[PDB]
Design a protein. Structure first.
Ligand SMILES: [Cl-]
Ligand SMILES: [Cl-]
Lengths: 166, 223
């Protein structure tokens, strides 16, 4: 594709080097955080938490040796610094959420996400097996939390803010 | 370029800078007076291309040209399989007059030779995570197909080859995409993809295997 992903200042989003907040377009009062899911003792699920704004910043990574991100590129999304792979996103079946966004400490060369234009911002789309069919990431309300999870046709729409406040 | 040095000025006169709002995002390679080869992942609907550069400031580079291009042709099997067939041809709006600082390079007909030392050039990130002010050059050595496939399967395809991974930590890096890998006087590859951080020992970068595409390139340029 031609379409370059841009931040809230209109600047191309960097390939891994800079961090960004995923700021929901109608939930700017809330931000990404980790929470417990199922019977797990460690918080490994990604939620939109009304107590954290702007929330945990992310980096977008492609193996391509380019310094910008296109909507067409398969991406890894991760929390933490460039040097760490302990915050890498994946999508995992977990009742009763469904296909939940969770953090891994392992990473494929080519991740399973794309960042696609939607409305006034972007949505995150998950491509099982890096195929042709994408599933929108939205919100699933369970146990008083708003989990990021597959909700095809009901995406959570984000703008992308460079994390220069840190 | 990781663990390289400033190029001898204008020693790579085929080098093209692809710029977006006055900032470099990819390189390419002049292969005909009206055509620039680059990586297909660098596709845009239009281009601003810097030729004859060393620094990226054309107003400080005698002999340089900043030229427009609208038309580009991605290889028809780009990204099937994923990351494969990573080349495109950009047709300049007008043919450039070649000089000692703006000159086309011939493409290798023969496949890469395992072990051979080659040169890669670009304006991408340095080991310190900063962008250079002038074009950088480094040597990397071609790795066998057996080693490339072991490291990169299931994404290794023969439209690719690997180079680097030495103890010397010499590599290409982000912003080097589309730029040249020169072997034994000929254009052998384009910078395509690899791992980050760049320059890991035992981890070569991946280059477009241009010997597989000499017929498609010649037919596209002649059509
Ligand atoms: Cl803003
Ligand atoms: Cl369970």
């Amino acid at each position: 594709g031609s379409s370059v992903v841009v931040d809230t200042n209109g600047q191309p989003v960097s390939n891994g080097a800079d961090a960004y907040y995923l700021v929901p377009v109608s939930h700017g009062h809330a931000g990404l955080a980790l929470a417990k899911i199922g019977n797990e003792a460690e918080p490994r699920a990604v939620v939109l938490d009304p107590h954290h704004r702007p929330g945990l910043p992310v980096r977008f990574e492609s193996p391509l040796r380019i310094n910008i991100i296109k909507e067409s590129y398969f991406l890894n999304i991760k929390f933490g610094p460039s040097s760490s792979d302990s915050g890498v996103w994946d999508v995992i079946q977990q009742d009763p959420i469904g296909l939940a966004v969770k953090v891994t400490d392992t990473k494929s060369l080519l991740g399973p996400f794309k960042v696609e234009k939607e409305g006034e911002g972007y949505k995150i789309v998950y491509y099982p097996e890096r195929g042709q069919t994408g599933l929108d990431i939205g919100l699933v309300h369970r146990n008083d939390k708003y989990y990021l999870a597959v909700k095809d046709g009901e995406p959570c729409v984000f703008k992308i803010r460079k994390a220069t406040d840190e | 370029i990781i663990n390289g040095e400033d190029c001898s000025p204008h020693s790579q006169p085929w080098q093209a800078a692809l710029v977006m709002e006055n900032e470099l995002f990819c390189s390419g390679v002049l292969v005909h007076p009206q055509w620039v080869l680059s990586a297909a992942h660098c596709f845009q609907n239009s281009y601003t291309i810097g030729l004859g550069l060393h620094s990226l400031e054309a107003d400080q580079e005698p002999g340089s040209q900043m030229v427009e291009a609208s038309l580009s042709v991605r290889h028809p099997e780009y990204n099937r399989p994923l990351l494969a067939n990573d080349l495109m041809l950009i047709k300049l709006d007008e043919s450039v007059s070649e000089s000692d600082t703006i000159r086309s390079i011939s493409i290798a007909s023969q496949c890469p030779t395992a072990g051979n030392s080659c040169l890669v050039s670009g304006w991408g990130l340095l080991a310190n995570g900063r962008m250079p002010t002038v074009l950088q050059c480094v040597n990397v050595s071609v790795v066998s197909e057996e080693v490339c496939s072991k490291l990169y399967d299931p994404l290794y395809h023969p439209s690719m080859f690997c180079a680097g991974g030495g103890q010397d930590q010499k590599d290409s890096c982000n912003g080097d995409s589309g730029g040249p890998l020169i072997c034994n006087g000929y254009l052998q590859g384009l910078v395509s993809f690899g791992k980050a951080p760049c320059g890991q020992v035992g981890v070569p970068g991946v280059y477009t295997n241009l010997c597989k595409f000499t017929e498609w390139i010649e037919k596209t340029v002649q059509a």
